[PDB]
């Protein structure tokens, strides 16, 4: 169940405030336009990091 990752998973690299700046950084990130596994239970390898997205209404 492969799904396009689009452009998500962007998080703040550190704690600094820059205004109108195009600063570029090297860190771990979710690659753009990758494949994610649609699920509907089992154990999964953690590896280095993970982008967990959830859509639910029952908080389960």
């Amino acid at each position: 169940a492969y799904t396009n990752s689009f452009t998500r998973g962007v998080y703040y690299p550190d704690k600094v405030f820059r205004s109108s700046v195009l600063h570029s950084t090297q860190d771990l990130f979710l690659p753009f336009f990758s494949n994610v596994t649609w699920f509907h239970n089992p154990v999964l390898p953690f590896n280095d990091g993970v982008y967990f997205a959830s859509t639910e209404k029952s908080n389960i």
């Binding site: 205004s19 600063h23 090297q26 994610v36 590896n47 982008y51 997205a53 639910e56």
Partner: protein, 38 residues
């Protein structure tokens, strides 16, 4: 209920801040040659 699981890789990103300090756009460096130029 549904949930998606991906993985993270160490690739260089470029970020665009705004007047208030919120990330509004990001560009990968090793996706395609135009982004490599950017």
């Amino acid at each position: 209920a549904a949930y998606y699981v991906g993985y993270l890789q160490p690739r260089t990103f470029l970020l665009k801040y705004n007047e208030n300090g919120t990330i509004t756009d990001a560009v990968d460096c090793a996706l395609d040659p135009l982004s490599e130029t950017k």
